[PDB]
């Protein structure tokens, strides 16, 4: 019933082409896209969801549309062959959120991290204080093989919303047999 615009941010790098998440990590992260799009549609039939990729390019393959079946057609041939790029992936995610055709919706980004990040901590904390001035809740969800709980991601969660902020949760995964049940326990309803 609440009005927002959720922007999912998948990874199609090479590092999702391994099988600790048992069938395929693409098959893991696509089901994660399956449950967040059906969550944001059934909790509110008025919002809209678009996807953005981050590896090797930043493609806006679906624009921020209310129908989810376009997204699910574009999750096929996602071609996991890229190399992770992070610093432009959120600035290209936010300028999409300044293209809101309905300017009463809130601004929300979710992102899937299945590759190690290689970026300065000073760049992201400038982006963190940018999003503080820009009032965006980004929910970082960790997948894949992981430099587990970096200080850069953890402080970016803290410097997203400090001094009694929202609490945009840093979702951590145990690498092993799991569904999106840890993804839906706390953060998909209380973020």
């Amino acid at each position: 019933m609440v009005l927002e615009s959720t922007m999912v941010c998948v990874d199609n790098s090479e590092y999702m082409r391994n099988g600790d998440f048992l069938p395929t990590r693409l098959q893991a992260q696509q089901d994660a896209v399956n449950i967040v799009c059906h969550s944001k549609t059934r909790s509110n039939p008025e919002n809209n969801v678009g996807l953005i990729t981050l590896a090797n390019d930043c493609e806006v393959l679906t624009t921020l549309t209310p129908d989810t079946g376009r997204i699910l057609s574009k999750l096929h041939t996602v071609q996991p062959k890229g190399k992770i790029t992070f610093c432009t992936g959120i600035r290209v995610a936010h300028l999409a959120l300044k293209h809101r055709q309905g300017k009463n919706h809130k601004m929300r980004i979710i992102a899937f991290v299945g590759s190690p990040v290689e970026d300065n901590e000073k760049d992201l904390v400038k982006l963190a204080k940018r999003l503080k001035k820009e009032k965006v809740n980004v929910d970082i969800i960790n997948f894949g093989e992981e430099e587990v709980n970096t200080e850069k991601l953890t402080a970016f969660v803290n410097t997203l919303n400090g001094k009694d902020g929202t609490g945009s949760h840093l979702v951590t995964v145990p690498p092993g047999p799991s569904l999106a049940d840890a993804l839906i326990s706390s953060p998909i309803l209380a973020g």
């Binding site: 806006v60 393959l61 600035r91 290209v92 300028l95 999409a96 300044k98 293209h99």
Partner: protein
Amino acid sequence: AVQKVVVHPLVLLSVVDHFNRIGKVGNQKRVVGVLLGSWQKKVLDVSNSFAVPFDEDDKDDSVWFLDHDYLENMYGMFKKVNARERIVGWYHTGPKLHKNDIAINELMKRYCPNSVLVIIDVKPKD
């Protein structure tokens, strides 16, 4: 290998107005739009065009937006009112081209393979 392009004199004109539409708030100093055309021979022809919502930031100079969704449906309308017309490329203004133009061109070559961009000069006319 394209021989040459032919400027129908409605398209330029229809870049001047849309630069004047946003020109009350114009500080981006660039307007990207889609160049409709008629592929005849090795020589090329241009008949019509339209615009697209476009943003760009010099900070990190790779953060920008064509709208694929707006490019699908509005071109689909111009296809419906005129089956002769199709896409041949795109355009922008602000006579110094910018570093992003590799990214726009290599994106929308998946609409027409031998796509072509045309820079007009709205303010220089001398």
